[PDB]
Short mmCIF file of all heavy atoms in Angstrom, two decimals:
data_model
loop_
_atom_site.label_atom_id
_atom_site.label_comp_id
_atom_site.label_asym_id
_atom_site.label_seq_id
_atom_site.Cartn_x
_atom_site.Cartn_y
_atom_site.Cartn_z
N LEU A 28 -4.25 -13.13 -15.15
CA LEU A 28 -4.54 -13.68 -13.85
C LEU A 28 -5.59 -14.77 -14.01
O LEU A 28 -6.49 -14.65 -14.85
CB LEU A 28 -4.98 -12.54 -12.88
CG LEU A 28 -5.65 -12.99 -11.64
CD1 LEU A 28 -4.76 -12.81 -10.41
CD2 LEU A 28 -7.02 -12.23 -11.43
N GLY A 29 -5.50 -15.76 -13.14
CA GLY A 29 -6.42 -16.91 -13.20
C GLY A 29 -7.47 -16.79 -12.07
O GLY A 29 -7.65 -15.71 -11.51
N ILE A 30 -8.08 -17.89 -11.78
CA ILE A 30 -9.11 -17.92 -10.71
C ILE A 30 -9.63 -19.38 -10.58
O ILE A 30 -9.95 -20.00 -11.63
CB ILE A 30 -10.16 -16.89 -10.97
CG1 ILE A 30 -10.58 -16.16 -9.73
CG2 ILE A 30 -11.36 -17.47 -11.71
CD1 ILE A 30 -10.43 -17.16 -8.47
N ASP A 31 -9.83 -19.79 -9.35
CA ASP A 31 -10.27 -21.13 -9.12
C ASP A 31 -11.12 -21.13 -7.81
O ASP A 31 -10.85 -20.31 -6.91
CB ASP A 31 -9.12 -22.13 -8.87
CG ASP A 31 -9.27 -23.40 -9.73
OD1 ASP A 31 -10.24 -23.61 -10.52
OD2 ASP A 31 -8.36 -24.28 -9.53
N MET A 32 -12.09 -22.00 -7.76
CA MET A 32 -12.98 -22.10 -6.62
C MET A 32 -13.31 -23.55 -6.24
O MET A 32 -13.54 -24.34 -7.14
CB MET A 32 -14.28 -21.36 -6.89
CG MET A 32 -14.09 -19.84 -6.79
SD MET A 32 -15.54 -18.99 -7.40
CE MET A 32 -14.84 -18.14 -8.80
N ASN A 33 -13.21 -23.90 -4.97
CA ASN A 33 -13.50 -25.22 -4.52
C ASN A 33 -14.27 -25.17 -3.20
O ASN A 33 -14.28 -24.15 -2.53
CB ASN A 33 -12.23 -25.94 -4.29
CG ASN A 33 -12.13 -27.20 -5.14
OD1 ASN A 33 -11.53 -27.21 -6.21
ND2 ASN A 33 -12.68 -28.26 -4.60
N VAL A 34 -14.95 -26.22 -2.90
CA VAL A 34 -15.76 -26.31 -1.65
C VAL A 34 -15.35 -27.57 -0.87
O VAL A 34 -15.09 -28.62 -1.47
CB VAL A 34 -17.26 -26.27 -2.02
CG1 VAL A 34 -17.90 -27.58 -1.61
CG2 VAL A 34 -17.93 -25.06 -1.38
N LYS A 35 -15.28 -27.42 0.44
CA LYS A 35 -14.91 -28.51 1.29
C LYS A 35 -15.64 -28.35 2.64
O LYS A 35 -15.31 -27.53 3.48
CB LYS A 35 -13.39 -28.57 1.48
CG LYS A 35 -12.68 -27.89 0.29
CD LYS A 35 -12.36 -28.91 -0.79
CE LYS A 35 -10.85 -29.30 -0.78
NZ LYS A 35 -10.70 -30.76 -0.80
N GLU A 36 -16.67 -29.20 2.76
CA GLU A 36 -17.50 -29.19 3.98
C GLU A 36 -18.23 -27.84 4.14
O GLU A 36 -19.28 -27.81 4.74
CB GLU A 36 -16.62 -29.46 5.25
CG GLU A 36 -17.35 -29.06 6.55
CD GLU A 36 -17.08 -30.02 7.61
OE1 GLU A 36 -15.95 -30.58 7.72
OE2 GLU A 36 -18.03 -30.20 8.45
N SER A 37 -17.60 -26.83 3.53
CA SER A 37 -18.26 -25.51 3.61
C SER A 37 -17.15 -24.45 3.25
O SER A 37 -17.42 -23.25 3.17
CB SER A 37 -18.80 -25.22 4.93
OG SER A 37 -18.36 -26.13 5.96
N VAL A 38 -15.91 -24.90 3.11
CA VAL A 38 -14.81 -24.02 2.80
C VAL A 38 -14.62 -23.98 1.26
O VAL A 38 -14.39 -25.02 0.64
CB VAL A 38 -13.53 -24.50 3.51
CG1 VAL A 38 -13.02 -25.81 2.96
CG2 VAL A 38 -12.49 -23.42 3.51
N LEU A 39 -14.74 -22.83 0.73
CA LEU A 39 -14.61 -22.58 -0.69
C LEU A 39 -13.16 -22.13 -1.01
O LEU A 39 -12.83 -20.93 -0.81
CB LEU A 39 -15.69 -21.66 -1.24
CG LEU A 39 -16.53 -20.97 -0.18
CD1 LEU A 39 -15.74 -20.65 1.10
CD2 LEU A 39 -17.27 -19.75 -0.75
N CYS A 40 -12.35 -23.07 -1.49
CA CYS A 40 -10.97 -22.76 -1.83
C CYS A 40 -10.98 -21.92 -3.08
O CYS A 40 -11.64 -22.20 -4.04
CB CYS A 40 -10.17 -24.07 -1.99
SG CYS A 40 -10.87 -25.40 -0.98
N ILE A 41 -10.16 -20.85 -3.04
CA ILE A 41 -10.00 -19.97 -4.18
C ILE A 41 -8.56 -19.93 -4.59
O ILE A 41 -7.71 -19.31 -4.03
CB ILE A 41 -10.55 -18.59 -3.77
CG1 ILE A 41 -12.05 -18.51 -4.01
CG2 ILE A 41 -9.83 -17.47 -4.54
CD1 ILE A 41 -12.78 -19.67 -3.34
N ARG A 42 -8.34 -20.67 -5.73
CA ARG A 42 -6.98 -20.75 -6.28
C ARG A 42 -6.78 -19.58 -7.35
O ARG A 42 -7.30 -19.65 -8.37
CB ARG A 42 -6.76 -22.06 -7.01
CG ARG A 42 -5.61 -22.85 -6.38
CD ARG A 42 -6.05 -24.29 -6.03
NE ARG A 42 -4.84 -25.14 -5.80
CZ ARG A 42 -4.78 -26.45 -6.04
NH1 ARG A 42 -5.86 -27.11 -6.58
NH2 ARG A 42 -3.68 -27.09 -5.79
N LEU A 43 -6.00 -18.62 -6.86
CA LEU A 43 -5.73 -17.46 -7.70
C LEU A 43 -4.34 -17.57 -8.29
O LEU A 43 -3.40 -17.85 -7.58
CB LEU A 43 -5.91 -16.17 -6.91
CG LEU A 43 -6.83 -15.07 -7.61
CD1 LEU A 43 -6.02 -13.86 -7.91
CD2 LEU A 43 -7.50 -15.69 -8.83
N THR A 44 -4.31 -17.44 -9.60
CA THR A 44 -2.98 -17.59 -10.33
C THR A 44 -2.83 -16.40 -11.29
O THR A 44 -3.56 -16.27 -12.27
CB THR A 44 -2.95 -18.97 -11.00
OG1 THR A 44 -4.33 -19.20 -11.34
CG2 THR A 44 -2.62 -20.10 -10.02
N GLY A 45 -1.84 -15.57 -11.01
CA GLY A 45 -1.56 -14.43 -11.83
C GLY A 45 -0.81 -13.32 -11.03
O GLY A 45 0.28 -13.54 -10.51
N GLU A 46 -1.48 -12.22 -10.95
CA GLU A 46 -0.91 -11.05 -10.23
C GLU A 46 -1.84 -10.59 -9.15
O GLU A 46 -3.05 -10.88 -9.18
CB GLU A 46 -0.54 -9.92 -11.16
CG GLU A 46 0.96 -9.86 -11.42
CD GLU A 46 1.29 -10.08 -12.91
OE1 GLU A 46 0.61 -10.90 -13.55
OE2 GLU A 46 2.24 -9.35 -13.39
N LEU A 47 -1.33 -9.88 -8.16
CA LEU A 47 -2.10 -9.38 -7.09
C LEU A 47 -2.00 -7.83 -7.03
O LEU A 47 -1.15 -7.26 -6.42
CB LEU A 47 -1.62 -10.02 -5.71
CG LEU A 47 -2.69 -10.83 -5.01
CD1 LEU A 47 -4.06 -10.28 -5.24
CD2 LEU A 47 -2.50 -12.30 -5.37
N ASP A 48 -2.94 -7.23 -7.78
CA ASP A 48 -2.99 -5.80 -7.93
C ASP A 48 -4.46 -5.37 -7.92
O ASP A 48 -5.33 -6.19 -8.07
CB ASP A 48 -2.31 -5.30 -9.18
CG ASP A 48 -2.03 -6.43 -10.24
OD1 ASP A 48 -2.92 -6.87 -10.96
OD2 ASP A 48 -0.79 -6.78 -10.25
N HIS A 49 -4.68 -4.07 -7.81
CA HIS A 49 -5.98 -3.50 -7.81
C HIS A 49 -6.79 -4.07 -8.95
O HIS A 49 -8.05 -4.08 -8.97
CB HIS A 49 -5.96 -1.94 -7.82
CG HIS A 49 -5.94 -1.39 -9.23
ND1 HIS A 49 -7.12 -0.86 -9.83
CD2 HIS A 49 -4.92 -1.22 -10.14
CE1 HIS A 49 -6.80 -0.43 -11.04
NE2 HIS A 49 -5.43 -0.65 -11.21
N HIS A 50 -6.10 -4.56 -9.96
CA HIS A 50 -6.68 -5.18 -11.10
C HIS A 50 -7.13 -6.60 -10.81
O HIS A 50 -8.32 -6.95 -11.00
CB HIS A 50 -5.73 -5.11 -12.33
CG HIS A 50 -5.71 -3.77 -12.96
ND1 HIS A 50 -6.40 -3.41 -14.07
CD2 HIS A 50 -4.91 -2.67 -12.62
CE1 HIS A 50 -6.10 -2.18 -14.37
NE2 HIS A 50 -5.19 -1.73 -13.49
N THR A 51 -6.24 -7.42 -10.24
CA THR A 51 -6.54 -8.79 -9.91
C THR A 51 -7.29 -8.83 -8.55
O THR A 51 -8.05 -9.76 -8.33
CB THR A 51 -5.20 -9.52 -9.86
OG1 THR A 51 -4.64 -9.28 -8.55
CG2 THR A 51 -4.18 -8.96 -10.84
N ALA A 52 -7.03 -7.82 -7.71
CA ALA A 52 -7.65 -7.74 -6.42
C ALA A 52 -9.14 -7.47 -6.58
O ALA A 52 -9.97 -7.79 -5.75
CB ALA A 52 -6.95 -6.65 -5.58
N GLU A 53 -9.50 -6.94 -7.78
CA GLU A 53 -10.87 -6.63 -8.07
C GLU A 53 -11.65 -7.94 -8.13
O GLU A 53 -12.79 -8.02 -7.52
CB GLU A 53 -10.96 -5.90 -9.43
CG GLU A 53 -11.75 -4.59 -9.18
CD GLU A 53 -10.79 -3.34 -9.45
OE1 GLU A 53 -9.95 -3.41 -10.33
OE2 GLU A 53 -11.02 -2.37 -8.69
N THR A 54 -11.16 -8.92 -8.84
CA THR A 54 -11.83 -10.18 -8.93
C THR A 54 -12.38 -10.64 -7.58
O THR A 54 -13.51 -11.08 -7.48
CB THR A 54 -10.88 -11.17 -9.58
OG1 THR A 54 -11.42 -11.49 -10.82
CG2 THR A 54 -10.83 -12.53 -8.84
N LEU A 55 -11.52 -10.50 -6.56
CA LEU A 55 -11.89 -10.90 -5.21
C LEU A 55 -12.91 -9.91 -4.67
O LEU A 55 -13.75 -10.25 -3.83
CB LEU A 55 -10.64 -11.06 -4.38
CG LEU A 55 -10.77 -12.06 -3.19
CD1 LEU A 55 -12.04 -12.87 -3.26
CD2 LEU A 55 -9.48 -12.98 -3.16
N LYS A 56 -12.81 -8.69 -5.14
CA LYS A 56 -13.70 -7.64 -4.71
C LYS A 56 -15.21 -8.09 -4.92
O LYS A 56 -16.01 -7.90 -4.08
CB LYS A 56 -13.37 -6.30 -5.44
CG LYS A 56 -13.77 -5.08 -4.58
CD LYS A 56 -15.22 -4.70 -4.90
CE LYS A 56 -16.21 -5.67 -4.27
NZ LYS A 56 -17.48 -4.96 -3.92
N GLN A 57 -15.40 -8.69 -6.08
CA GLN A 57 -16.69 -9.18 -6.40
C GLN A 57 -17.04 -10.41 -5.59
O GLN A 57 -18.21 -10.67 -5.29
CB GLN A 57 -16.87 -9.43 -7.91
CG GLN A 57 -16.02 -10.66 -8.33
CD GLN A 57 -15.82 -10.75 -9.82
OE1 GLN A 57 -16.50 -11.50 -10.53
NE2 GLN A 57 -14.92 -9.92 -10.31
N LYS A 58 -16.04 -11.15 -5.28
CA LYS A 58 -16.18 -12.36 -4.53
C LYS A 58 -16.64 -12.02 -3.09
O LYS A 58 -17.00 -12.90 -2.32
CB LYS A 58 -14.88 -13.23 -4.58
CG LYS A 58 -15.01 -14.45 -3.63
CD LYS A 58 -16.07 -15.42 -4.08
CE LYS A 58 -16.09 -16.66 -3.23
NZ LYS A 58 -17.41 -17.37 -3.30
N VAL A 59 -16.53 -10.72 -2.81
CA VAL A 59 -16.93 -10.26 -1.46
C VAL A 59 -18.42 -10.19 -1.40
O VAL A 59 -19.02 -10.81 -0.51
CB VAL A 59 -16.24 -8.91 -1.20
CG1 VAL A 59 -16.44 -8.45 0.22
CG2 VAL A 59 -14.76 -8.96 -1.59
N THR A 60 -19.00 -9.48 -2.30
CA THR A 60 -20.47 -9.30 -2.35
C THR A 60 -21.12 -10.70 -2.33
O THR A 60 -22.13 -10.87 -1.63
CB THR A 60 -20.85 -8.47 -3.60
OG1 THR A 60 -22.18 -8.82 -3.86
CG2 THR A 60 -20.08 -8.92 -4.85
N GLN A 61 -20.58 -11.62 -3.10
CA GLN A 61 -21.13 -12.93 -3.20
C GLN A 61 -20.97 -13.63 -1.84
O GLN A 61 -21.92 -14.29 -1.40
CB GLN A 61 -20.42 -13.74 -4.29
CG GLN A 61 -20.32 -12.94 -5.59
CD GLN A 61 -19.40 -13.62 -6.58
OE1 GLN A 61 -19.74 -14.65 -7.18
NE2 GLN A 61 -18.22 -12.99 -6.80
N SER A 62 -19.83 -13.45 -1.21
CA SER A 62 -19.56 -14.06 0.09
C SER A 62 -20.30 -13.28 1.18
O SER A 62 -20.58 -13.86 2.25
CB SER A 62 -18.11 -14.11 0.36
OG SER A 62 -17.69 -15.34 0.98
N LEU A 63 -20.61 -12.06 0.89
CA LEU A 63 -21.34 -11.17 1.81
C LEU A 63 -22.55 -11.94 2.37
O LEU A 63 -22.95 -11.77 3.53
CB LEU A 63 -21.67 -9.88 1.17
CG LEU A 63 -21.03 -8.63 1.82
CD1 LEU A 63 -21.65 -8.32 3.18
CD2 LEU A 63 -19.51 -8.73 1.85
N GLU A 64 -23.12 -12.77 1.51
CA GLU A 64 -24.32 -13.50 1.87
C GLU A 64 -24.55 -14.65 0.88
O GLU A 64 -25.45 -14.62 0.02
CB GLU A 64 -25.57 -12.63 1.94
CG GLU A 64 -25.58 -11.85 3.30
CD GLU A 64 -26.99 -11.31 3.58
OE1 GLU A 64 -27.78 -11.06 2.62
OE2 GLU A 64 -27.25 -11.10 4.83
N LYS A 65 -23.69 -15.65 1.00
CA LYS A 65 -23.75 -16.81 0.12
C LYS A 65 -25.09 -17.61 0.49
O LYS A 65 -25.82 -17.99 -0.40
CB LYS A 65 -22.51 -17.64 0.22
CG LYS A 65 -22.60 -18.88 -0.69
CD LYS A 65 -21.47 -18.88 -1.70
CE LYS A 65 -21.92 -19.45 -3.07
NZ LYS A 65 -20.74 -19.80 -3.89
N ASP A 66 -25.24 -17.83 1.79
CA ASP A 66 -26.39 -18.62 2.27
C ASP A 66 -26.19 -18.96 3.75
O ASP A 66 -26.51 -18.20 4.63
CB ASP A 66 -26.54 -19.86 1.47
CG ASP A 66 -27.52 -19.76 0.29
OD1 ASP A 66 -28.06 -18.69 0.02
OD2 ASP A 66 -27.70 -20.86 -0.38
N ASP A 67 -25.60 -20.10 3.97
CA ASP A 67 -25.32 -20.64 5.27
C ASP A 67 -24.04 -19.96 5.81
O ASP A 67 -23.95 -18.73 5.87
CB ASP A 67 -25.10 -22.16 5.28
CG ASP A 67 -25.06 -22.79 6.64
OD1 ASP A 67 -25.17 -22.12 7.66
OD2 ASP A 67 -24.96 -24.09 6.65
N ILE A 68 -23.09 -20.79 6.20
CA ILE A 68 -21.86 -20.31 6.74
C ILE A 68 -20.69 -21.14 6.26
O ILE A 68 -20.32 -22.15 6.87
CB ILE A 68 -21.94 -20.20 8.26
CG1 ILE A 68 -22.46 -18.86 8.71
CG2 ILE A 68 -20.54 -20.44 8.88
CD1 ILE A 68 -21.85 -17.72 7.96
N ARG A 69 -20.20 -20.78 5.06
CA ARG A 69 -19.08 -21.50 4.48
C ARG A 69 -17.76 -21.08 5.06
O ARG A 69 -17.73 -20.40 6.07
CB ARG A 69 -19.10 -21.27 2.94
CG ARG A 69 -19.80 -22.35 2.22
CD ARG A 69 -20.87 -22.98 3.11
NE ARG A 69 -22.16 -23.18 2.32
CZ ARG A 69 -22.98 -24.18 2.53
NH1 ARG A 69 -22.74 -25.11 3.53
NH2 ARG A 69 -24.11 -24.23 1.80
N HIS A 70 -16.68 -21.54 4.48
CA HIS A 70 -15.34 -21.15 4.93
C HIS A 70 -14.50 -20.68 3.73
O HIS A 70 -14.80 -20.97 2.58
CB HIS A 70 -14.74 -22.31 5.68
CG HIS A 70 -15.43 -22.68 6.95
ND1 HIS A 70 -15.85 -21.71 7.85
CD2 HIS A 70 -15.79 -23.89 7.50
CE1 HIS A 70 -16.43 -22.32 8.89
NE2 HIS A 70 -16.39 -23.69 8.62
N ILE A 71 -13.43 -19.95 4.07
CA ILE A 71 -12.52 -19.43 3.04
C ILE A 71 -11.29 -20.28 3.03
O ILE A 71 -10.93 -20.97 4.00
CB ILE A 71 -12.29 -17.94 3.28
CG1 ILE A 71 -11.41 -17.71 4.50
CG2 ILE A 71 -13.59 -17.15 3.35
CD1 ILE A 71 -11.16 -19.06 5.28
N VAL A 72 -10.59 -20.23 1.88
CA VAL A 72 -9.38 -21.05 1.72
C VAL A 72 -8.54 -20.51 0.49
O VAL A 72 -8.69 -21.05 -0.62
CB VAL A 72 -9.66 -22.50 1.61
CG1 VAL A 72 -8.81 -23.16 0.56
CG2 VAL A 72 -9.53 -23.20 2.97
N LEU A 73 -7.85 -19.38 0.73
CA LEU A 73 -7.07 -18.77 -0.35
C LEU A 73 -5.74 -19.56 -0.47
O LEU A 73 -5.30 -20.16 0.48
CB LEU A 73 -6.91 -17.29 -0.05
CG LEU A 73 -8.18 -16.46 -0.19
CD1 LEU A 73 -9.01 -16.90 -1.44
CD2 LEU A 73 -9.01 -16.47 1.10
N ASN A 74 -5.21 -19.44 -1.64
CA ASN A 74 -3.94 -20.11 -1.94
C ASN A 74 -3.48 -19.79 -3.38
O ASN A 74 -4.01 -20.27 -4.32
CB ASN A 74 -4.07 -21.62 -1.84
CG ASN A 74 -4.88 -22.14 -3.02
OD1 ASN A 74 -4.99 -21.59 -4.07
ND2 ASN A 74 -5.47 -23.32 -2.75
N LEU A 75 -2.49 -18.87 -3.44
CA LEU A 75 -1.99 -18.44 -4.77
C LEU A 75 -0.62 -19.10 -4.99
O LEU A 75 0.28 -18.97 -4.16
CB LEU A 75 -1.90 -16.90 -4.80
CG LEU A 75 -1.55 -16.30 -6.21
CD1 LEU A 75 -2.34 -15.03 -6.47
CD2 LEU A 75 0.00 -16.06 -6.22
#
């Protein structure tokens, strides 16, 4: 599984490439805590 991150005005695009399972879903799990309180108010943008 891959992983990508981008920012746009405040939207952090996350390019995930691989599989979507509790294994790959974990990666995003950690992205939660980070997003839980990044700082200001960004935006999400998923795209696999």
Side-chain angles (χ1 to χ4, degrees):
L28 165 108
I30 221 330
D31 229 3
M32 284 171 243
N33 241 94
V34 116
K35 337 266 258 131
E36 162 142 34
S37 15
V38 70
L39 7 36
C40 333
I41 274 51
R42 241 129 164 210
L43 231 244
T44 33
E46 256 118 321
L47 242 328
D48 12 78
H49 91 99
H50 284 262
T51 84
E53 236 113 37
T54 247
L55 209 8
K56 208 270 75 151
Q57 70 195 260
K58 173 67 175 157
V59 189
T60 157
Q61 313 169 72
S62 220
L63 242 290
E64 280 197 334
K65 180 124 217 196
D66 267 0
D67 191 357
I68 273 314
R69 266 25 137 149
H70 294 316
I71 70 357
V72 140
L73 290 319
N74 70 25
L75 186 142

